[PDB]
Design an enzyme around this catalytic site. Sequence first.
Site, PDB file in Angstrom:
ATOM      1  N   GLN A  84      47.768 -88.405  -2.455  1.00 15.30           N
ATOM      2  CA  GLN A  84      47.650 -88.389  -3.909  1.00 15.30           C
ATOM      3  C   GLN A  84      48.415 -89.217  -4.501  1.00 15.30           C
ATOM      4  O   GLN A  84      47.651 -90.239  -5.262  1.00 15.30           O
ATOM      5  CB  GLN A  84      48.535 -87.130  -4.476  1.00 15.30           C
ATOM      6  N   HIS A  97      35.603 -76.167 -13.876  1.00 13.90           N
ATOM      7  CA  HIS A  97      35.883 -77.801 -13.900  1.00 13.90           C
ATOM      8  C   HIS A  97      34.718 -78.293 -14.777  1.00 13.90           C
ATOM      9  O   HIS A  97      35.151 -79.208 -15.595  1.00 13.90           O
ATOM     10  CB  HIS A  97      35.291 -78.352 -12.336  1.00 13.90           C
ATOM     11  N   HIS A 157      27.423 -82.161 -15.306  1.00 10.25           N
ATOM     12  CA  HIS A 157      27.478 -83.065 -14.338  1.00 10.25           C
ATOM     13  C   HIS A 157      27.662 -82.695 -13.026  1.00 10.25           C
ATOM     14  O   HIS A 157      27.670 -83.884 -12.096  1.00 10.25           O
ATOM     15  CB  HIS A 157      28.848 -84.221 -14.793  1.00 10.25           C
ATOM     16  N   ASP A 158      28.408 -81.605 -12.608  1.00 13.04           N
ATOM     17  CA  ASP A 158      28.322 -81.204 -11.352  1.00 13.04           C
ATOM     18  C   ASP A 158      27.571 -79.816 -10.860  1.00 13.04           C
ATOM     19  O   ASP A 158      27.876 -79.248 -10.022  1.00 13.04           O
ATOM     20  CB  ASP A 158      29.868 -81.038 -10.692  1.00 13.04           C
ATOM     21  N   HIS A 196      34.487 -77.400  -7.435  1.00 12.56           N
ATOM     22  CA  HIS A 196      33.101 -78.033  -8.213  1.00 12.56           C
ATOM     23  C   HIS A 196      32.454 -76.887  -8.772  1.00 12.56           C
ATOM     24  O   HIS A 196      31.451 -76.443  -8.648  1.00 12.56           O
ATOM     25  CB  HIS A 196      32.593 -78.937  -7.598  1.00 12.56           C
ATOM     26  N   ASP A 231      36.274 -86.611 -15.795  1.00 12.06           N
ATOM     27  CA  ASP A 231      36.082 -85.972 -14.439  1.00 12.06           C
ATOM     28  C   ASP A 231      37.268 -85.984 -13.815  1.00 12.06           C
ATOM     29  O   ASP A 231      37.657 -84.980 -13.013  1.00 12.06           O
ATOM     30  CB  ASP A 231      35.073 -86.807 -13.565  1.00 12.06           C
TER      31      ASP A 231
HETATM   32  N1  AMP Z   1      43.614 -85.387  -7.339  1.00 16.18           N
HETATM   33  C1  AMP Z   1      42.478 -85.669  -6.507  1.00 16.18           C
HETATM   34  N2  AMP Z   1      42.641 -86.215  -5.297  1.00 16.18           N
HETATM   35  C2  AMP Z   1      41.680 -86.823  -4.692  1.00 16.18           C
HETATM   36  N3  AMP Z   1      40.457 -86.714  -4.958  1.00 16.18           N
HETATM   37  C3  AMP Z   1      40.257 -86.360  -6.309  1.00 16.18           C
HETATM   38  C4  AMP Z   1      41.193 -85.942  -7.092  1.00 16.18           C
HETATM   39  N4  AMP Z   1      40.555 -85.526  -8.418  1.00 16.18           N
HETATM   40  C5  AMP Z   1      39.391 -85.800  -8.156  1.00 16.18           C
HETATM   41  N5  AMP Z   1      38.946 -86.211  -7.021  1.00 16.18           N
HETATM   42  C6  AMP Z   1      37.721 -86.704  -6.533  1.00 16.18           C
HETATM   43  O1  AMP Z   1      36.688 -87.175  -7.426  1.00 16.18           O
HETATM   44  C7  AMP Z   1      35.638 -86.515  -7.583  1.00 16.18           C
HETATM   45  C8  AMP Z   1      35.020 -86.746  -8.906  1.00 16.18           C
HETATM   46  O2  AMP Z   1      33.806 -86.441  -8.786  1.00 16.18           O
HETATM   47  P1  AMP Z   1      33.142 -85.049  -9.355  1.00 16.18           P
HETATM   48  O3  AMP Z   1      34.280 -84.111  -9.451  1.00 16.18           O
HETATM   49  O4  AMP Z   1      32.410 -84.559  -8.198  1.00 16.18           O
HETATM   50  O5  AMP Z   1      32.141 -85.282 -10.460  1.00 16.18           O
HETATM   51  C9  AMP Z   1      35.870 -85.202  -6.961  1.00 16.18           C
HETATM   52  O6  AMP Z   1      34.691 -84.755  -6.501  1.00 16.18           O
HETATM   53  C10 AMP Z   1      36.998 -85.577  -5.644  1.00 16.18           C
HETATM   54  O7  AMP Z   1      36.356 -86.210  -4.635  1.00 16.18           O
HETATM   55 MG    MG Z   2      30.337 -84.809  -9.050  1.00 16.71          MG
HETATM   56 ZN    ZN Z   3      33.313 -83.563 -11.428  1.00 12.52          ZN
END
Ligand code: AMP
Ligand code: MG
Ligand code: ZN
Length: 324
Positions: free
Chosen positions: A280, A83, A117-118, A79, A228
Amino acid sequence: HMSICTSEEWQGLMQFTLPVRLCKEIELFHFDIGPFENMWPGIFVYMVHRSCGTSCFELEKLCRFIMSVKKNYRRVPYHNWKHAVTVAHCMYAILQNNHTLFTDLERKGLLIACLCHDLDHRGFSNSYLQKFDHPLAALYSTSTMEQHHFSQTVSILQLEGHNIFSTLSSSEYEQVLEIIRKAIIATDLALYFGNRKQLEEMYQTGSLNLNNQSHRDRVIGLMMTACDLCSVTKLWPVTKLTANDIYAEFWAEGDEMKKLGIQPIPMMDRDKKDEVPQGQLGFYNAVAIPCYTTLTQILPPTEPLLKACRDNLSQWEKVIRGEE
Ligand SMILES: Nc1ncnc2c1ncn2[C@@H]1O[C@H](COP(=O)(O)O)[C@@H](O)[C@H]1O
Ligand SMILES: [Mg+2]
Ligand SMILES: [Zn+2]
């Protein structure tokens, strides 16, 4: 409390020129910003200018804003600043392919929301913050980190010379902040499940209406989820390398949980890496595939994202079959 970019930093961005060859590649959904780190801020400037116009924002304020946003992303495995730009680029591709469906205000608001966003993510999930009563969980009962990311965004806009939205009329200003807030909150995956189910139904029954604000909000929410999670729509090697970063954060969180006497879920247990492929597969089946499937139904031009996601699902299945 917010970090602020230096003058050399935003001035350098102002003079940055994007290699002619990349201009063409940036329009594609599968574009990977990975090998062009020094150019990431410039790539965002380029996308804003192409989608919203070279005079949308005062260049100086935009450069300060971008470089201060970069400085407020932490040096965590996933994050992070990379990203943020990756998600913003996916939004750019979605907007370019569906340009007139969105207002100028929505496009500038969404590109900015994606970059922010993060903001200030520390590598810990809402699950962790709430389980251990972090102060943020007390302040923001639900969508904890996301409410924080929005607060961080507003804080940067409040830095001297950083408010890129000040030239908007008072009504458009309040409107864009709301677009940004809703967009960032939508990145809380917990809300995605209900949002996708609702949109799928509205679409299937033919009641989906983009002239209906609540409907627009939901479509924008699904777009945010899609952007995202876009690492799953890149070429397999990129997707696999990014998964390594995602798990690096998961494992670090799980380690802290063990220290507090709580066994983490297998996905966050570094002693259970053999379960990653199946984990996954589960994520793609329950989250990724349905997301891009519904998005493609609503916005046909986004089909390349779904095709790429399906290809990566197949790759994870190959891993499970021992064909890696
Ligand atoms: N390939 C993946 N496998 C598992 N969790 C994922 C994957 N890609 C994204 N995520 C989850 O999706 C969330 C998206 O929210 P964010 O990136 O915090 O905005 C991430 O924080 C991860 O927890
Ligand atoms: Mg997030
Ligand atoms: Zn994100």
